[PDB]
């Protein structure tokens, strides 16, 4: 049982300045046996260095691989924008290959909080049987981002699902949607339904709520 | 050089199993592993199990042992992956990878399990969902409040399949401040986006605000106007 972990999560990086990507092995191993790959949004991935330092074929100079034992690096130098993307790292020994969970290299900016919003549900969602509220997250930074459901101070989880955008590629910034699922019986229940959100960019975290009838 | 062609997009009943193929086209085909990888919507790569094709050297990942068949067809010079009783959990798109090495190896019969994937197929979508076609329905996400004289108006586009949609505001005419989210499929199996806009607060009693929702595989096109709620 080897496991992978890479850090960080995401890597904010200027045009022309040098990231370090980490990669962490459950035990010892060799350094034969370990790769990294780069994916681009939308396209299929592509191995960047094998054996831990063997550079593959086509790939620019940018790019050079070390480690040993448990601990391995990607250094990118130089950085240039088709060096957005996720990179990974993988072992390729004895029977069971691994992948790292990857990493994240995105465009460095100013820290950005959030602008909340929360939307109830429209009365035609309503007369249909289920009852959807919405939170939006608009052109933050960093990525990372923390949102929590309530009704009438009630933790809510499992009943929410999140999108995020792309990184926008006029601010740097990304927006979240978290949408909270609930039937119409259940919706007309309760009456304060919050979205409590949580930002590197806030110096605590913002709740913006609503009552069910405008209360 | 080495290349790898894979069989189209799958769209599967929770429970059944897909079969996807992979089509080498150039080298060897028993020198070398044959590495499936797979990945789930906003995950990481999964490894799931290689095989050499006729020297019939393989492993499969433990996640998928009791429900995972590798294979090959030699005349044909094709191989396959066969994932049974699937779940949500098994959409993704599945790629067939392998290491290029000596090409044609006119100086090694020797096969190899243990590789990099410099060469990898262009992926193959699998969507394991129990719906068929249906067009989704519209509603409305109303502005109301005392945001620095911004407002957020939306669309909430719910309860269709398959992808895509597509969402315009004002036929086309409003593009700043639109974000259109990805689509994600929710527990039954249907997609669900909502597309917002940002728009200055103090004219939302004389602007209109209209999204265009266009489903094509349903002949589907919807135009809800946004309107405050009071
Ligand atoms: C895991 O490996 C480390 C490092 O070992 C060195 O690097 C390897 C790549 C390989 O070349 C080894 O032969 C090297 O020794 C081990 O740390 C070493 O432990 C030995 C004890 O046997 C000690 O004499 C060395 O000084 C240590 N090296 C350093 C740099 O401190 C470590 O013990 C290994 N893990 C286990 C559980 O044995």
């Known amino acids: 049982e080897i496991v992978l972990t890479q850090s960080p999560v995401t890597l904010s990086l200027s045009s022309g300045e040098t990231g370090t990507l980490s990669c962490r092995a459950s035990?010892?191993?060799?350094?034969?046996?370990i790769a990294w790959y780069q994916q681009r949004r939308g396209q299929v991935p592509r191995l960047l260095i094998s054996?831990?330092?063997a550079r593959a074929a086509g790939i620019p100079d940018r790019f050079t691989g070390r480690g040993s034992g448990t601990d391995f690096t990607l250094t990118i130098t130089r950085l240039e924008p088709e060096d957005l993307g996720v990179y990974s790292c993988?072992?390729?020994?004895?029977?069971?290959?691994?992948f790292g969970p990857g990493t994240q290299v995105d465009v460095k900016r100013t820290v950005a909080a959030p602008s909340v919003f929360i939307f109830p549900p429209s009365d035609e969602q309503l007369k249909s049987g289920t009852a959807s509220v919405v939170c939006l997250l608009n052109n933050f930074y960093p990525r990372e981002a923390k949102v929590q459901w309530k009704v009438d101070n009630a933790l809510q989880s499992g009943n929410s699902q999140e999108s995020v955008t792309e990184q926008d590629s006029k601010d740097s910034t990304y927006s979240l949607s978290s949408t909270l699922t609930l039937s119409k019986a259940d919706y007309e229940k309760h009456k304060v339904y919050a979205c409590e959100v949580t930002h590197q960019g806030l110096s605590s975290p913002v709740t913006k709520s609503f009552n069910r009838g405008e209360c | 050089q080495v290349q790898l062609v894979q069989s189209g997009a799958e769209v599967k009943k929770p429970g059944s199993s897909v079969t996807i193929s992979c089509k080498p086209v150039?080298?060897?085909?028993?020198?070398?592993?044959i590495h499936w990888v797979r990945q789930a919507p906003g995950q990481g790569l999964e490894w799931v199990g290689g095989?050499?094709?006729?020297?019939?050297?393989?492993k499969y990942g433990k996640k998928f042992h009791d429900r995972l068949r590798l294979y090959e067809d030699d005349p044909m010079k094709t191989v396959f992956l066969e994932l049974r009783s699937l779940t949500s959990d098994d959409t993704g798109v599945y790629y067939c990878?392998?290491?290029?090495?000596?090409?044609?190896?006119?100086?090694?019969?020797?096969?190899?399990?243990?590789?990099?994937?410099?060469?990898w197929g262009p992926g193959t979508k699998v969507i394991v969902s129990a719906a068929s076609t249906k067009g989704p329905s519209v509603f409305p996400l109303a502005p109301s409040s005392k945001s620095g004289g911004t407002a957020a108006l939306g669309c909430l586009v719910k309860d269709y399949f398959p992808e895509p949609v597509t969402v315009s505001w004002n036929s086309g005419a409003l593009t700043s401040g639109v974000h259109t989210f990805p689509a994600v499929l929710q527990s039954s199996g249907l997609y669900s986006l909502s597309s917002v806009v940002t728009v200055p607060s103090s004219s939302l009693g004389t602007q209109t605000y209209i999204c265009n929702v266009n489903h094509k595989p349903s002949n589907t096109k919807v135009d809800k106007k946004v309107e405050p709620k009071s």
């Open positions: 150039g080298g060897t085909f028993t020198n070398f592993a």
């Open positions: 993988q072992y390729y020994g004895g029977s069971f290959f691994t």
């Open positions: 054996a831990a330092s």
């Open positions: 990878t392998r290491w290029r090495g000596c090409g044609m190896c006119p100086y090694d019969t020797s096969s190899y399990y243990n590789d990099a994937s410099d060469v």
């Open positions: 095989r050499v094709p006729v020297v019939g050297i393989y």
């Open positions: 035990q010892n191993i060799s350094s034969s046996w």
